[PDB]
Design a protein around this ligand. Structure first.
Ligand SMILES: *[C@@H]1O[C@H](CO)[C@@H](O[C@@H]2O[C@H](CO)[C@@H](O[C@@H]3O[C@H](CO[C@H]4O[C@H](CO)[C@@H](O)[C@H](O)[C@@H]4O)[C@@H](O)[C@H](O[C@H]4O[C@H](CO)[C@@H](O)[C@H](O)[C@@H]4O)[C@@H]3O)[C@H](O)[C@H]2NC(C)=O)[C@H](O)[C@H]1NC(C)=O
Ligand SMILES: *[C@@H]1O[C@H](CO)[C@@H](O[C@@H]2O[C@H](CO)[C@@H](O[C@@H]3O[C@H](CO[C@H]4O[C@H](CO)[C@@H](O)[C@H](O)[C@@H]4O)[C@@H](O)[C@H](O[C@H]4O[C@H](CO)[C@@H](O)[C@H](O)[C@@H]4O)[C@@H]3O)[C@H](O)[C@H]2NC(C)=O)[C@H](O)[C@H]1NC(C)=O
Ligand SMILES: *[C@@H]1O[C@H](CO)[C@@H](O[C@@H]2O[C@H](CO)[C@@H](O)[C@H](O)[C@H]2NC(C)=O)[C@H](O)[C@H]1NC(C)=O
Ligand SMILES: *[C@@H]1O[C@H](CO)[C@@H](O)[C@H](O)[C@H]1NC(C)=O
Lengths: 44, 472, 101
């Protein structure tokens, strides 16, 4: 890995939904559904 | 004894009387019934109804009333007729009362007049203090009337002394053409708009902006009119719109609410327009201002027992023998009425010291958020309660546009024989993430593909972008 | 028995004389500019002072010829804000910044 960049969501500048979508991604990351969604597509 | 009060009002062409004239007669009847003030004096009224901008008609009816004998003239609303009857009243020593604001030349030497509309210097300072509280940088000011730019002087003076960028736009002379103005608002990212119009024009502009999809949480509106609580806010209540306004009618009082409910019975005889986007039964600002005008003039009559009705002529200009003492008693009056504190300036005779109720729109409706005074400035009632963990039901009902790019297992094109249409046209990791986010927050969403087909990078030549970043 | 009225210069007196001449059907002549109510029903008057919308468009044309970016506008009375509204609303049409004193 040359860099260590991150994949977020594309929100407009000064969006009202961005803090709510940030804590939504945090709550989804705590429940482990992100790991299941990662493990449902990257195989072959 | 008896005492005649003369009122010039707008002539309705067909139908019921106006709100100002009805509030004038209701004020006269309410003073003439309750013996709290002036027990030994009963007041009578004479009303003359004129058209718009006919100051010759206004001067003729004022001369007819002064030939009849009037202690104090409650003048008209529009500016030229108000200035004409102001010159009539100052010429003969008769007191003059203003309800609506008018523009006065500063070199005018007339002094036989008072006004109860708040001065727009103080209102402009209140709007500037609200803007400085909200920490804005780019403000779009929309004004309706060409004389309305005088009402927003200090906002225009503000970029000289502060850091601010104004974009001033005029409404069209046609009433229903707010759609190209709001189309101009959508370009250029106009987000913080200060509107300066009547509340009927505000209702029409809010309808035309709801139809154009500008009732989002991005925009913030400040209305300079003093009757935003009378506005129907039922479709705009759950839209999450940042909206702030001013109130002068302190409706939380018991006497104010009882007077409002008594006057609503007289209002329901007049048929209103129920499809105009106006909330029913709420008194306007000028009706309560005329009620407080009759009340404070009766207060000034109460401290003068030598008040006699004397007729005067217009062909000669003999001054009135009771003009100076009664005008000094009017200007030194002070009363708590429907607009709260009522006092006058010793120099201009304009209402410049008052109270303002800074209100705003939330998800439950309109609610008071602060108090403004010319001495204390702004005073915001602080609200930070916390506990934000109800985000599952937050973003419950907002249509949302999601833009992806048709590559990678994040956004995979669905492969099936039947050509379905909708949000389930795609699969992959990002569609699963969108399904999980719509499971959590609950927002209605749609997926439209990016027509550029690029991720997005800054073009170093022109400074522009492309793809998802420019589309955002 | 006059045939026409050459009225005064101050705006309130000219408005009163204009309403009198409109009611009596007499021609009224104005020589100084007054701010006009946008929905007046008056049609019995003329004014030979040049209209400030056209003069403000001439001002904006001169500004665009001189190729300016920051412009300080200074007036004397309140009615000058009515007298220069075309120059005032000329931002967000061109790349012009206004500071108004
Ligand atoms: C109008 O609509 C908005 C949103 O729709 C309502 O909420 C306000 O939102 C703004 C922006 O989120 C709040 O502004 C504050 O800005 C502070 C400084 O700005 C820097 O940081 C922001 C990121 O937050 C950058 O974008 C910016 O460029 C600056 O670099 C922040 O520090 C504030 O965060 C603070 O408060 C939160 C919550 O208390 C804390 O958790 C943080 O740790 C931090 O201390 C904030 O972002 C503004 O304060 C919001 N208003 C209110 C009352 O909270 C408006 O309320 C709404 N107005 C009306 C009248 O309806
Ligand atoms: C009858 O009518 C007259 C005419 O309007 C009133 O006189 C004005 O009163 C208002 C407020 O009552 C005054 O407005 C104020 O402006 C001040 C700044 O002007 C200053 O300008 C320079 C500095 O640039 C000084 O040299 C000069 O002396 C002035 O002090 C503000 O300081 C005032 O308060 C504000 O303070 C800070 C901002 O600095 C904030 O907390 C608030 O924004 C707060 O508003 C105030 O805004 C005005 O100056 C008076 N004079 C004129 C000629 O207009 C009478 O008051 C009125 N009589 C009554 C009500 O009884
Ligand atoms: C849009 O969503 C809001 C919730 O954010 C709905 O508001 C609720 O409306 C009901 C009906 O009056 C009230 O009893 C609730 O108290 C409201 N809840 C909140 C949190 O405000 C609103 O009704 C929705 N709009 C539609 C058309 O259904
Ligand atoms: C703001 O209003 C509250 C409510 O009465 C009051 O207690 C407080 O002293 C006020 N603050 C200022 C600074 O005026």
């Amino acid at each position: 890995l040359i860099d260590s960049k991150g994949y977020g969501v594309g929100t407009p500048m000064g969006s009202p939904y961005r803090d709510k979508i940030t804590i939504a991604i945090l709550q989804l990351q705590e429940e482990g559904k992100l790991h299941m969604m990662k493990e449902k597509w990257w195989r072959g | 004894h008896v005492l005649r009060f003369g009122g010039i009002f707008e002539y309705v062409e067909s139908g019921p009387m106006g709100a100002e004239e009805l509030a004038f007669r209701f004020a006269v009847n309410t003073i003439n019934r309750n013996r709290t003030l002036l027990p030994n004096t009963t007041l009578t009224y004479d009303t003359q109804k004129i058209n718009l901008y006919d100051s010759f008609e206004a001067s003729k009816k004022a001369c007819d009333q002064l030939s009849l004998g009037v202690a104090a003239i409650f003048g008209p609303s529009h500016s030229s007729s108000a200035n004409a009857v102001q010159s009539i009243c100052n010429a003969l020593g008769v007191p003059h009362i203003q309800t609506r604001w008018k523009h006065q030349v500063s070199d005018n030497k007339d002094s036989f007049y008072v006004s109860l509309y708040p001065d727009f210097s103080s209102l402009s300072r209140a709007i500037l203090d609200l803007v400085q509280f909200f920490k804005w940088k780019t403000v779009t000011v929309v004004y309706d009337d060409s004389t309305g730019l005088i009402r927003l002087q200090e906002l225009i003076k503000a970029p000289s002394r502060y850091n601010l960028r104004l974009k001033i736009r005029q409404l069209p002379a046609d009433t229903k053409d707010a759609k190209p103005l709001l189309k101009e608002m959508k370009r250029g990212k106009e987000f913080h708009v200060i509107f300066d119009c009547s509340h009927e024009m505000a209702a029409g502009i809010l309808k035309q902006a709801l139809a154009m999809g500008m009732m989002t949480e991005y925009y913030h509106y400040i209305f300079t009119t003093l009757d935003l609580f009378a506005l129907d806010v039922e479709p705009y209540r759950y839209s999450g719109v940042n909206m702030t306004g001013f109130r002068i009618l302190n409706t939380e009082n018991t006497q104010v609410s009882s007077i409002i409910e008594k006057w609503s019975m007289e209002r329901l005889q007049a048929p209103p327009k129920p499809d105009s986007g106006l909330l029913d039964g709420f008194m306007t600002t000028d009706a309560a201002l005329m009620y407080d005008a009759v009340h404070v003039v009766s207060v000034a009559v109460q401290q003068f027992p030598q008040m006699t009705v004397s007729s005067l002529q217009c062909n000669r200009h003999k001054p009135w023998r009771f003009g100076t003492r009664f005008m000094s008693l009017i200007k030194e009056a002070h009363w708590e009425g429907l607009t709260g504190r009522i006092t006058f300036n010793k120099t201009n005779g304009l209402r410049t010291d008052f109270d303002l109720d800074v209100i705003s729109l939330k998800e439950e409706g309109l609610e008071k958020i602060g108090t403004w005074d010319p001495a204390s400035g702004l005073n915001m009632t602080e609200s930070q309660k916390g506990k934000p963990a109800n985000i599952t039901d937050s973003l419950s009902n907002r249509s949302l546009i999601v833009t992806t790019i048709l590559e990678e297992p994040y956004v995979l094109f669905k492969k099936s024989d039947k050509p379905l249409y909708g949000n389930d046209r795609f699969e992959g990791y990002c569609i699963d993430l969108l399904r999980e986010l719509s499971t959590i927050l609950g927002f209605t969403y749609e997926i439209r593909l990016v027509e550029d087909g690029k991720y997005g990078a800054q073009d170093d030549v022109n400074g522009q972008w492309n793809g998802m970043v420019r589309e955002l």
